[PDB]
Structure 1
Amino acid sequence: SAKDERAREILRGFKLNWMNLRDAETGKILWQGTEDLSVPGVEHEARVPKKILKCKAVSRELNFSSTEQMEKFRLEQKVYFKGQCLEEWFFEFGFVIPNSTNTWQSLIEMMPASVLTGNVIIETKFFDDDLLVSTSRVRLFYV
């Protein structure tokens, strides 16, 4: 199918270059990285500071490249605790220019760290509109 082939083309041309999280209130950097966590088929890992769990809101910046044009680039992210979905987040970037590099700022808005750590999976789905480009997993440790 044409839609399957396009999804792979977009996947093929897609790269996450760097990313970070800040406390929304203070603007202070909780975490940053250049590990491409979008990469499917691999269980990624990330160590975040436990104080992030007390933030009312977190500001995330992503920087990505795409060789392919996308009309409605967006993400669905699901927070699993021991295999149980606890929340779902939706973010929309919109139109992506072919061969562009883009910064995307999104705002994200309770068990203790010690219970959560190692038991939280973030499952991220990359879409162009209804077309599923990629599915990726990150296990979180809180330190």
Structure 2
Amino acid sequence: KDERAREILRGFKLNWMNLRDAETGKILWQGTEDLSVPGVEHEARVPKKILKCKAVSRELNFSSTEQMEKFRLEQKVYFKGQCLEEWFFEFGFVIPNSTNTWQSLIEAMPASVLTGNVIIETKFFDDDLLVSTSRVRLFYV
């Protein structure tokens, strides 16, 4: 059960990801490093104009050796320790040993005040079950 969360973490990998202006479909940020690895504070530099898109599109590519009934995400935006927004997204069923693209739409203080002060804390779940908790500190450039 906490053992099951541990196997799912073991078999999981986020292979690549990007963030797009939903209005134009232009890539604003992409990376192939697994930002959802727990135990370390990740960092990401994004263009300051991403804050001006009302709709941001995300593509997440991941592999999973374990099956999952209801793979989903809870994401919290923290500015200097205070939670400002919460986002929920759901993938659902994941086939064991599969690789999957998951597309999500994310929808609607200046850059210079936010930059370095925002942590996006992401929790992965199989249903009620918490697989991992990770952090990215954001810089806006």
Matched residues, number? 141
Query: What are the superposed Cα offsets for residues 103-129 of structure 1, whole Å, 9 maximum, x if unpaired?
Result: 000000090000000000000000000
Q: Percent identity?
A: 99
Query: What are the superposed Cα offsets for residues 66-108 of structure 1, whole Å, 9 maximum, x if unpaired?
Result: 0000000000000000000000000000000000000000000
In structure 2, how many angstroms separate the alpha carbons of the residues matched to 1:43 and 1:127? 20
Q: Give TM-score scaled by structure 2 length.
A: 0.99
Cα displacement (A) at 1:138: 0.1
Contact 2:70-2:90 within 8 A present in 1 as well: yes
Pairwise CA RMSD = 0.9
In structure 2, how many angstroms separate the alpha carbons of the residues matched to 1:89 and 1:110? 11
Cα displacement (A) at 1:7: 0.1
Query: What are the superposed Cα offsets for residues 13-32 of structure 1, whole Å, 9 maximum, x if unpaired?
Result: 00000000100000000000
Contact 2:20-2:27 within 8 A present in 1 as well: yes
> 1:34/1:135 Cα in 2 relative to 1: closer, same or farther (>3 Å)?
same
In structure 1, how many angstroms separate the alpha carbons of the residues matched to 2:22 and 2:98? 27
> 1:81/1:100 Cα in 2 relative to 1: closer, same or farther (>3 Å)?
same
In structure 2, how many angstroms separate the alpha carbons of the residues matched to 1:110 and 1:124? 19
In structure 2, how many angstroms separate the alpha carbons of the residues matched to 1:13 and 1:81? 32
Match of 1:57 in 2: 55
In structure 2, how many angstroms separate the alpha carbons of the residues matched to 1:63 and 1:110? 24
Q: 3-state SS of the aligned residue for 1:126?
A: strand
Match of 1:67 in 2: 65
The unaligned stretches of length 5 or more in structure 2 are none
> 1:64/1:112 Cα in 2 relative to 1: closer, same or farther (>3 Å)?
same
Match of 1:116 in 2: 114
In structure 1, how many angstroms separate the alpha carbons of the residues matched to 2:11 and 2:78? 28
Question: Which stretch shifts more, 71-80 or 105-114?
Answer: 105-114
The unaligned stretches of length 5 or more in structure 1 are none
Cα displacement (A) at 1:47: 0.3
Cα displacement (A) at 1:54: 0.3
